[PDB]
Amino acid sequence: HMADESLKDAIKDPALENKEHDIGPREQVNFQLLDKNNETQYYHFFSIKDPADVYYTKKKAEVELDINTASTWKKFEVYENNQKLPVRLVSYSPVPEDHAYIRFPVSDGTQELKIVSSTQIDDGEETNYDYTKLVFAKPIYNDP
Amino acid sequence: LKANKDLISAGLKEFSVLLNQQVFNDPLVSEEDMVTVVEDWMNFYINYYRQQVTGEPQERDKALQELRQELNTLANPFLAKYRDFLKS
Amino acid sequence: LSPADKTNVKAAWGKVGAHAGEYGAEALERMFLSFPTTKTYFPHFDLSHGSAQVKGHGKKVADALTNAVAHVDDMPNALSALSDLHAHKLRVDPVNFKLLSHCLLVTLAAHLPAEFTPAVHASLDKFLASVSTVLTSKY
Numbered sequence A: 001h002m003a004d005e006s007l008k009d010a011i012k013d014p015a016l017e018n019k020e021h022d023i024g025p026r027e028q029v030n031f032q033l034l035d036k037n038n039e040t041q042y043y044h045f046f047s048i049k050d051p052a053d054v055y056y057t058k059k060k061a062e063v064e065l066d067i068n069t070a071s072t073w074k075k076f077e078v079y080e081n082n083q084k085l086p087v088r089l090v091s092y093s094p095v096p097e098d099h100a101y102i103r104f105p106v107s108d109g110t111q112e113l114k115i116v117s118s119t120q121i122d123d124g125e126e127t128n129y130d131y132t133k134l135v136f137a138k139p140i141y142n143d144p
Numbered sequence B: 001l002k003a004n005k006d007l008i009s010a011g012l013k014e015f016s017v018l019l020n021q022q023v024f025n026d027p028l029v030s031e032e033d034m035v036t037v038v039e040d041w042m043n044f045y046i047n048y049y050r051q052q053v054t055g056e057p058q059e060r061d062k063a064l065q066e067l068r069q070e071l072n073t074l075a076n077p078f079l080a081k082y083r084d085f086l087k088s
Numbered sequence C: 001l002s003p004a005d006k007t008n009v010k011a012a013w014g015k016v017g018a019h020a021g022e023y024g025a026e027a028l029e030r031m032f033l034s035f036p037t038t039k040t041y042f043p044h045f046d047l048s049h050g051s052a053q054v055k056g057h058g059k060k061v062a063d064a065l066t067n068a069v070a071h072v073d074d075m076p077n078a079l080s081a082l083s084d085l086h087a088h089k090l091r092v093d094p095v096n097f098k099l100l101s102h103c104l105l106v107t108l109a110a111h112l113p114a115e116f117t118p119a120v121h122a123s124l125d126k127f128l129a130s131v132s133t134v135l136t137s138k139y
């Protein structure tokens, strides 16, 4: 139901058919998706769009993550210093594109953040990705 | 054996899906080269399901023998169908 | 293509990872043994067994396929620049792309037998079928 719990079922909501998610001042920030042994997390590297759009608000900057093949993505938990962040769906491009756009707030001076996630194709084998480190090109800072 | 019997059924179904998805656009491959491609597919299905099958050594060998024969019944019409397409 | 096929292609090519350049050269060598008509020499290229250019070409094939998987939602645009390559148009016969991409499945499934299910095999077959038609679209 939630973005963190299951993206498969999160994108079922037709209210986010092609909802707007490109309003307000944003920033382009590159990143790298590594794994437990500091090697390239390949599945994530192909799945997530680089760079990511960093939208500004009145409190904290919200990092948008464009995730492709959302129909197979299930778990997608994001943490900041081992503290779970509130992830949510802001929009979703339907098939054949199948891109899911999710946002979450990040505090000032943040750059590294781990991702606990998984994938599942329909009623089949669940592939767990217990650790994936996401390092931005620069530390994220929100404008006043 | 039931476990092996049901595993063969899924193997034949999955193999038929592979044959159906093939597009015969230009540039077309020759009859000789398509025979090699079919053999490479059948050998892959034998390699995979040889790990999946269970039971005694002779029970697994007899299961893979039935699978290889069952795959040829699906392969021979596909090769014959391709020969009629290639000549035109 | 489909969400399942796209997911299978990322997972298969993800588990390949850094060994993509090795399989690219290996698949090219496997093509000549399986298809002897494909084996032909030309002046400005080194097609020896332990060649530097064949290994170099494997990395180029790997980097092209890696880009194709990275932009699998729009594959034709990702391989549009590569489809106009003069070396392919002049040296390579159009049919050999289907034969090389076939041998890459044989190579990948050989080195990664556990992760390569019949479902994933058919997913990469369809994916590698489209890449062959895109590169041979210009001729």
Ligand code: HEM
Pocket (backbone or CB within 6 Å): C044, C045, C057, C060, C061, C062, C064, C065, C082, C085, C087, C088, C091, C092, C096, C097, C100, C101, C131, C132, C135
């Ligand atoms: C579908 C599989 C293949 C892929 C993805 C591929 C990819 C590439 C790429 C990316 C390049 C470099 C082009 C550049 O400079 O940007 C290249 C060059 C080349 N390829 Fe392929 N190739 C494939 C199959 C083949 C085959 C079957 C042959 C036939 C032997 C071949 C022969 C050549 C030659 C002669 C060059 C020129 C390299 C040089 O001297 O600079 N390729 N290929």
